[model samples]
Target: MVHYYRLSLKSRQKAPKIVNSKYNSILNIALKNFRLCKKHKTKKPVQILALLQEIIPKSYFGTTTNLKRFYKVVEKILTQSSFECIHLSVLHKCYDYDAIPWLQNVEPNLRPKLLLKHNLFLLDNIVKPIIAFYYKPIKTLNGHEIKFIRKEEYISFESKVFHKLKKMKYLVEVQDEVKPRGVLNIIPKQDNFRAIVSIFPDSARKPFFKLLTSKIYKVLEEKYKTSGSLYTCWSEFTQKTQGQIYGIKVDIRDAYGNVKIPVLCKLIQSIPTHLLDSEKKNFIVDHISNQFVAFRRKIYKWNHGLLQGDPLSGCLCELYMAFMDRLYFSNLDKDAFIHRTVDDYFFCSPHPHKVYDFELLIKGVYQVNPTKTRTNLPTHRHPQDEIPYCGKIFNLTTRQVRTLYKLPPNYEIRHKFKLWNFNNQISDDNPARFLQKAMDFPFICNSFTKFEFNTVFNDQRTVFANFYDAMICVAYKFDAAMMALRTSFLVNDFGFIWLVLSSTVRAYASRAFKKIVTYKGGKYRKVTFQCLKSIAWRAFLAVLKRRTEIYKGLIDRIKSREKLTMKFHDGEVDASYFCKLPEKFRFVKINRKASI
Candidate 1:
């Protein structure tokens, strides 16, 4: 028998470059200790203690006291008879690890390499930036478009669609041929595929579709009043109870795919004729019917489910849910509350009341996604102290809410929301409801504990380092004005002042003076700064360039503001902060992302 044996040889790796020559002797002594420990697997107590003492004061950034404290710990470990060698892992790929005398001869024990250069400019050559679809990245999460053309057994899919479509009376019969394709949001998968129908926006039906749906959207006041809405009703249901509040959460799986067409029509007509009138509402109903699209030149139509791309789908969905809420509202108790935005449901009460009842009713109407349907109790998988729900970490134990993840330092938290009063009665506690609880035990902003404080500073340090490093990519092509505008735009989204943003830009401007070194000599030198005059000159120019852009935007907002007369109980309630607001807070407006 013949056998082939392959031996695995470890490749030498790179370590990060040492900061400066000032710490050269200290690093050299550390390497001596590393080699000594490797040979004897431990060093003598006297040698270990003395070596550490000699290296303590050379460091400038930290205190000698800190080094002495850690120095003692290393002294004890090295003196321990049972202790062996220290283990290290490699990180950098191409760093000059063997530049020093000790690390020379391609030390097999020491594995590390230098870092590769940033290719942002090189990548921009292949992928286009903002003005058009210029450049695309291969390894990025958000930019991976995941383009694909999917096909099924064509004849069978076409036949099945034509057969199923006859059931929907609201559906209009399709004779026109059009090809439609979908790109998966793959980040979420969008619950299977979202149909990419092309007839929208460009076709004449586009204007009429908007006309029909916008009217229906205006008429859905009862929905805004009764059901859950995205930005509207989050604060109202935060009431707490001393009694055990058992909860069950269920989701209507494929909400857009399940509601029956005929039932949707009934709910649409269920609206009073005075509000929308029959002909107008009927036009909406008829418009929603008979939708068709082509799959690989094979035409297909769906009869039962809502059309993926149409605005009519959401209006009809809200209509059906509004009708259901009216029918079921009488069955539920006042102590209990129901929330179902789009499809996610949260039904809770002091006792085992209508929570399960509503779940069964929803199951009867549509399929409940088994994956998300479960009980939420303190003792169960979801603890009361750590209940992550609706983008906020809800702590039932303390009745506090915070973001689900740690926020960075100097990050502004926008917790204030426009509270909705179903009857439009102004009250003192409206804004406070979103901010804190005043009921049995009101939920408020979570306490800023050590975890949060540490994360903010840590994340801030990381941001600072990465921002400075990104300066290498900011060569001749970088426009300080353009970056200033982009940075301000991001800061606006975070709801913070421009002061912090300007400071960040100023730091980057200072980093711009740091020089990248490539030596022609025998010995190599790492990156160093230029002369003080040039350094100050370069940073000063960049800072002033950005200052102008920031104020230009500030003046634009200043120019746009116009005053309006304040309404409401003007005499009874003083027009203080309300007058400053561009729009008054109202509840129950509907949108795609917010719901109940």
Candidate 2:
């Protein structure tokens, strides 16, 4: 019999001792400075930095170097954990080959933002969790190499996009300042990329964005009249349920790019500007017509559809989609719900024929349409498929919402894992290192507090009552998986996590772990039985948590750090958080807030 070892949650966790020494002096009070900024209602760092120069004594705040040093530290804190950096795929993709002309230091595949994220980001709050997941210690790099080189040794990852020199007649002064840089963002489902030209007011685009802001505000106020949230859409949907409903989803593949410029202008022209600025409306049309995006130090005119990065473009896209939805209503079921956020749309109806109706509508709109496979919207409901909308997968029948990266409940695999070692094939693309890089899970509480569950019950009429429950369960499994993987990674157990995994990855991890732990016939490192038992235990638990979590009754989740507890209380054991079983069980009042 295997001895039961009580898991030390804190001891099991990774603890890094080394801290960034350069910013050590100011690190303690840096967060305090941010709080002080809020008191004066000026949150801008540069503004506060300049105010310090005026308010403080010149003798104390001596040289320009002193101010500049502090400024860089502040900027470093702000820019770390970048929104735009490529986190996972950067290891394989090469940087700009054109930079070979000025090359001196070793060429790296990843961008600078990623380099800073892994190495330089010292702020404990963000870096602690980031380092825990995104990166592994040098020992567990699998086969990858790392060099802690000087800052100057690494090549620059700055943007080279320049604004166009075109003469603007309408918003003349704003044109020069509106320097849009082309940035890349990944589409999770496709594992592909999308280019966005930043139109947000950063430096000079401040005036340009301000010009677009008020108009965008008008559109925002007008939004409540048209669209609905997931709750509203679901409420209206469940209200009119008649039969077996097929979930039909809609999405604009290249949404902003799909819209016609002339149609977009007409959308702008159609809006009621009677009470608003009259002449500004004309400028709005032309300003959108003549826009610029900079990439590779070259300018691209925005004669294309919508400026995707621009907020107004999003509003225009929504308005245009709104019109499309209006026309699409004729094609949908008599009692269907069309809910959308910008480009993501979920069209729910009782009829399966309605899917074909939507297909016909798409064919009528875009002449050469996507084939009957429905790859455009990525729906697979007939095969127990889910409708992916807004970073979640929804099952209309079960009324369940799970994170997008997670596989649907009992989702069949395209390939199965081969546990045997000799037949397993491993390559660079097939490495378990990819599995180590995880999907970004959202921040969620361990369990819902009294008020949280109460609201979950109260809003049974509106929201998905089990949304948090679904999310909490998923988060628990995710936490366990990461912890197990981290420990296994240290022991060179690369294959530890590929179980709930992607298919090919599971096979690869098995072979990798096999060679490391299994004793060969000749001379041996003499694999310890105790160590093997611990690894096997964790591996078993990871699988156990993934498979058995649904069976456990809903209750307190956060109490145990290393393990999920089954309180088996009234909440999950028998009583429903919201819904009551009618046939076997009688309806009982649950005043969740009152704790009765």
Candidate 3:
């Protein structure tokens, strides 16, 4: 029978000294190997270097100079353990016969957790119970089971507290900045130390959080027209509001970080009972009030503003802005129209002084950036001739907005590399998705500009041309399976491709038509109603021409007649689809089982 050898706390307390001695023994073995290499003059130093790396702790030989010093001195040790020597054989079996029962049965993959000498000294206590389970007599061990839990399993269990902690609000840290403990160190000192709470993984909170926001949005939307995107905001502003109304833009300074906690809590508590039940409302309020953030292992309660990184922060900020808008509405000039997108506010008024007074009122509750606030009226113009609100430039004189395209420096090079990798099968990203990302700039430009449609349409053509070139290159390089997939994307989904182009053109046309009829700024011969209409129509033609080129390219590349599809050819290409159908055709009765 095998003798029972138990590893106790006493043994673990002695493990560090034992491990250090063994590490030193391996160095002697490495010296023998190095001598053998020197005598044989072997070309490969990699194996020797790796052997040295594993044996010598990084703490000892940390730098290139230390390694060089060791290399120069290693030849001095002559009576060391060679590969075949009895000393090396004995050195390999460092653990004694008494330790075999406890040490041998340990999971091969399990490694020691280091937390300085105090923690290391307690490992024997940790190992005693585990060792007993495997080493006990067969009769005593019978019917008894020892279930081992992995480190990952414990961590997974620990994360469940986030759901419980999140409800308490104040204890939850949704966002925190973190870096690896020894990331900047040339030689990392500690094995066990790692950054904690670096990233907040909140998959469980998303569903409930999203549902709450949706309900809040429904209530808010009924009260005010809040267009979130820059395109819609600019387009809606120019289309709806007529005449030369003065423009005043103000931005809240550090809006998310400066939100008044007491005021926010009060507002949340007072949410109408009709919007949500009192119980549900209280739950939401408590969650926001108890918000906390974590940095490493330390947690902090937020006394003031909402967390800038939280998904719910934007909604909370908007709610506060809406509340403030109501207060300003009662006090400000009756003709004033206040449009808000989070912390940024655009006020349209006949009197510039009234809007300036309103800007002062907004600064009372929330600190406003003096430099960012500007009005486009007499005695109110800041150094900036025009206001750059959202992505469009707001001109006070012309009372028109222009689209701004500010691409990052790496834009072209990055996209080119992505496309190259994509074509070579190095990446599995969808080609259509990549094309859409590149096309977004042109789409935004078209959505915002009325008179600049010609310029914007030309830009869209350039993007389409690049997309076409890439598709052609991919088509030729693709194998049978790839070709089938690629062909389907270009041809079968031609309607989607056409829709992107035509929809952008349609949006530009609608905005241009509205601007041409409504604004007096277009009375000049250079930008008259007829002249702007002609320019918009020409841009519409340009997109149609580019759309037809893509269809021709698809037909040339794909041979099968059955595969040649254009579902939106009639509905999208024809102008009649935009018109309202007669009442008779609109309410056509159809049998569910019968074909049209």
Candidate 4:
């Protein structure tokens, strides 16, 4: 068994011992003399530097805490047997390439503010258990699993908590001045530490994250108190959240094997330690192991897309590849690529020679079987390459390189997005309402409640003005899956409930059209208004439940971080934060708050 300790967490408790040193002194002096603007109470660089040092260290406080616990265990082990050198290995899951800069140095400082600015709510808290299963180091608390706050409710939670903390005695004030932890040194540039054993595509285990933090800090503080140089573990993927503030990318690949057994076994063993109940763990372990073995053997062989049987399959494949690459071609000359998961890989070096080596390495690994294949090409203009390495297509023949590249032909499409309508029946008793509801149009072009000024006319000017957004509400009083593509939708409006009533007027006309088309002959003699009205009513009854299957694609995307997590696509995109700034001051702020 391998012993575990997190360097980042340990670094924090050691802060006081290194304070007043050259690294900490410069930042201290810089902050002491800096000035700020009158209206905007932003901290000066030095002050930010000071705050950065204080918070960054505290962020890793778990290290010291965890270390003490580990030592007590180790002392008992030493009493039993004498060992010379103990090799420690750590596997860290990464979040994404976009998170690299923040994790390295900047993110720790801005994390609190970012958390404060965003809006987050309840369901956001629910998915954390799912994430914890993906990331290693499960931390279980009480009976309830902790989860992330919703995107909309985040701001509310932060403002209250931040203000409370700011007012507290223990919290460091950050308005005009920064209270430095005078005992510790925390200047990143001046400190050099060796990072040992890491992995990518971190866990989505938001629910159990606090436990991981506390446990990590505790382990770190205890272990380093005795020996070893600086050691830090950071993720390079799936760490797009505020917690992952640093990252390191390295090059690696593994031997050709359809399924990785060692990583899978280790992950399965961890499940028992994590799950609250042993019986549940055994059940889950049996089901998951069988599921993954079947999936690896059956699915994903011919099809290329996200596979589900094993929650950690993606993460396991990544670690397998990283470990394999290091074991086999560890001598290869390359800048390295961080294999976040089976599908997510980031190219860390663009140099031609290093790129060439990676290309050759991938080509060699892909020859395991007829179904398993991997290839890295200089350019994607060719139609045969499966995985596009190097992050771009290089026209080797034309000597041109593209920063952004396309995948090769025949590449399996990953989860294609689709759209469908909501209804399909027509009637006369309520023709308008039938069309609107059947077609699944969004309700509440505007919806708000106000006392009627003059209750007679039913004038709703107040409803129309000042508040109007395209809103479509779907109320499923039944099962989770809607199953069909049409005629199922809901209305989120109570005040404009009359508007829906007004739409029902068209059902009357729809009744007549059905009779004309159904039993009525071409001659006017055979056709009757009553017959048409009866047909219309029949059509209306067929669609008794007023529901719709509309463009839920948009709403669904917003609900799951599965879509937005670490995927940043095409063109320059800015957040509402950027738009809120003044045009004159809309420049990128370096190492500080950039606002206009």
Candidate 5:
């Protein structure tokens, strides 16, 4: 099998001229240990090396030698037992370039090479077909463009990639059109092939997928390696290139579309038949356990639909995505095809004449579910729009390559939603439900208009609900109250921040106020009896905040319902700290008299 190196224009650079003189560096010491473990097939040392290499060098501007530092870090990871210790050491060393030795060979492993590279860039130059593939393209929305870079962190971008890859079906009974073109490894006698691949998930999805993938890869790798090339990938006779497929970047991620209960059941019907031993099932369940804890979900929810990390659930999701893709792609014109990992899918049409027709076809497919992604459509073509098969946008618009922007680290978390009041009266506790009214507040944000969203949370209720449910399920399964509490608060709080910020930008311009301004003008809106009530109502906030935490604590005590009580009251407390404005604030200040 020929290993391949595809280069990005910016990534091209002078190949390192290795001085093999100092082969005894500390990095080499740890690397030798890893190799010894691989040779013996013994689990003596768990040496995990995360290699982020720059195959091309031109990505650096005006030549600063990022590659030099990059190589040294790799060296340390290869050698050091405690990765964090080395990381701190590097920090103390202060970006010093002269501290480490250089490389001689890129591929130093004989066990198995899990190559990581962009499939799009590599597929364009492929001369032969190959079996098996995996990828996690760090895709992100660039203004309007979606580009698959190495570091895709935007939730919108990662989510699109996640759904599209999941929906693809290249592994299911290999396609008939390229019966001769199939490129992945061919086992000695079994037509049944095992391929391990990965797609980048939104951060929320990553932990689940990672644990699941590791579990499956361990099984497949151990079972297939000894006899022959399990996958036709790493063989010498194979023509070297980046990826086996190219062109249209098609991705599909539907929250409710094909992953429905019925679809999931259909996919897993064969699980019993294929699973000959109970140990395998236990293996799956155990891995799912680890995954649940990692993400912090309540154990009870696992029964509802198999928690996100469950191997069975993942397989089910993959099957659903593939099934839906078959439906969508089979309907497209002969030239168009679908590619995917799980829910993450990519639609591509080599025939230029069918572009417009295929685009319309995709929209019809999206409307099949209750939550069509807003960013996944072809709208919002900012001049800097860069992604080709942007999950958030259409493929017609180019993926913006030059306009990536990160939100400020100190960006304010805005959250001043109007507390709902029925009949112009805001009750102290159980004050009218705001979530019910704005079930579709950002209805324009997604395509699915029929979902039964929560009716209590105005903006972030849905996000909170899903997280809360998952946490409950996790807690129930593991009997971990503390774990449940930690997970619940983490997801809800972050989600709240996401909801508030996303809404603030579109809800109101809010010229200069960090909070809210129902009546934003001069003192005319001030000093009324009702105004006093409005201000006094804020005093209730202290009680409410504490009460909310108490309620959460009770909810987490799932087994002990005796601890939960509806009888709760809050007392008055200072609200000054709650309303303190940051120093960056600019407000109405007296021009004539300076008064403290």
Candidate 6:
């Protein structure tokens, strides 16, 4: 049988040097272990354990406790009487055995070879094929650009490789390409492919593709920066639209799958051939033409667009859309600005009908569902020129663009739970360290848009009151701790004299009510204004107390240092800090004044 073990010998010679370092390390360890085992006829479990214990500690920096646990597990596995003898016997004898213990009856070795035959078998069959599939070329002095095998060549490669694995009974057949039997995330969701496509040659092709695509994406990003991204589109929407205008957002249906393979290939080919080295050209060809989707143990040739989850899929999809964007909407009326990210496109114009033509243009290439399309028009009933794009709701009623907060996703809710749990568990003494650690949390911000915080807090209370309260508690503690810490560190008025008091206490209270009101007196229900104004007032006073302490401390320090003068005096310092600052604190703005 042409098993992977047999192929390892060939792979050792043919496998490219440039492979994943982690995988290479595994191979090296296995090779050394096998050689050591065979050299001393060390087939017994004790002998094996002894060898592994010495070797394992050299590679691993774990505690002695973990090493002891590992030793016990290894002993238990090798002590199994059924396979232990058989497994040991097979080491000196020849032939591979399945996981079945029946091999115990068949194997009794009398003639042991001077060299390790079983080691050779494993290296050839298992190690070789793994390396061949996973490794790719390294840079050569001459730089031959050892290319990807052609479509026909890769097809031949797949057939030969799959056939060998099949003969070894490693890959078995299934009934059909249904749930569990087929694959996961092979098709496109609202986003690109949720399921990964396993065409099997990406370890060989991806490095080449990434190098080429990086150059392509850099060039494309420069061209489309103003109109292509969500940030830019929002900027453009607010800037271009006046009191009221027509806006539309449409997504191309099954965009990733609908892109014709030939069309995508043609577009890719149009990139200056000189930019793609021979390896890159060959890599692209194999990925496009030789790709196959395995379902129900049956391989089906992929005859359409790039599969999602492929490293190159996003870049290629962007390029395809960029081409389409320029081809169709570039010459629109001077009043219109069209923008897209991958398949979803948004357009704004004074005349609503001018944008309708765009749907018709894309329909020729792929199915465009009119039902999914939405248009926002100025009306007496609904005067706000609000439209949803990406995740944010945008209103272009005024000159500056405004965004309405969308509800958090389920994953985000779970993430908030994790953050809350961590905050409660954290026992750090230094407030600066705590701030550094917790800075990534969304709620811990400098400031918010005018009404955005109130809107979000009110809306989220219905769903995430407990979670919101936890975050509020975290915020108060963070701010108080930060202020108190700053006071201790302020040796001179030069410190904290920076014109801003940086804290999230105000931001947190705005989002998290100082006191929460719940239904029927339940402990962890939700928050409300049903409680008295005292709770809210008290929370603000607490933050003020911390600020007061810092100012008091600075005053004390200045008085004690009779020779030293104050950088800023009482009331001269900016007590109210900038909210929603990009950084934790910036002392850039300072005042050089003193007080009595």
Tell me the alpha-carbon RMSD of every candidate: 25.3, 22.3, 22.1, 32.0, 27.4, 20.5
| Residue-by-residue lDDT tens digits, candidate 6, 441-472 | 45433123222222222233222322232333
Q: How far is candidate 6 from the true structure (C-alpha RMSD, Å)?
A: 20.5
TM-scores, one per candidate: 0.41, 0.43, 0.42, 0.22, 0.24, 0.42
lDDT of each: 0.37, 0.38, 0.40, 0.26, 0.28, 0.41
Task: Give candidate 1's TM-score.
Answer: 0.41
lDDT of 2 by residue, 1-596 (tens): 21111111111223233325532323233333323433463333223235334432233223554344333333322222111111222221233333322222435543333323322222233222222232222211111112121122111211111111223321122324335544322111223233455543364465765766666666646742546466556645764675666665555566676677777677666667672346556766776776665544344565546755765666667667667666555545657766666655456667666666765665565433232222222344444455666655566664544344333332211111111122222223333442433322222221222211222212321112333233333333344334323322222344444343433223322332353333132212233333322222233243334334431321122113223222221222232332222221122111111000
Candidate 6 has its poorest 10 consecutive residues by lDDT at 587-596
Steric overlap count per candidate: 30, 2, 4, 77, 76, 15
The most accurate candidate by lDDT is 6
Query: For model 4, how does the per-residue alpha-carbon lDDT over 166-229 read when each residue is reduced to its tens digit?
Result: 3752123232312211111111111221101111224345344444334334433442232121
- Which pairs of residues have clashing backbones in candidate 3? 9-124, 169-290, 169-291, 170-290
The worst-scoring run of ten residues by lDDT in candidate 1 lies at: 2-11
Better-scoring candidate (TM-score), 4 or 5: 5
Which tens-of-lDDT digit does each residue in 1-596 have in candidate 1?
11111110111122222324422333444334333433453333224344334432334113444344333323322221111111111012223444433334445444332111111111121111110121111111121111111122223443454344445442334455543321111111333323334443454466776777677666676444645452223234443456555666667776766767777777677777767776777766765555555544455555546766665677777766766666655577665656666777666666664556666776766688766666655434653334445544444333333344332332111111112222332222122221121111111122122211122212322222222223211211122222222321112342232333333334443432231111111111211232222222232233223345544654343235312231232233233422121111112111111000
Candidate 3 residue 169 C-alpha distance from true site, Å: 18
What's the true lDDT of residue 319 in model 5? 42
Model 5, runs deviating above 4 Å: 1-258, 271-306, 311-313, 350-353, 356-596
Residue by residue across 120-198, what tens digits does model 5's lDDT show? 2111211000000011221122111112222222334444533443356222232123112112221111122122212
Better of 2 and 6 by TM-score: 2
lDDT at 98, model 1: 41
- Candidate 3, residues 1-596: lDDT per residue as tens digits? 21111112123221222334322332343334333433454443223234434444443333555344333212111111111011111111222222222224345433121111212222232222222221221111111211223323334544454443346543434344442111110111112211112224553477876897787776677665564555444445554556656767888776775777777778776777777668566775765666545533645554446655556677877887677667655676544555667668777665667766776777775678777687766665454446766655566554444443333322211111112212222112244443444333332333333433322212222222222222222222221122222321222443444444333334444554454344323222222333322333333332223334434653333233212122221221333322222122223211111000
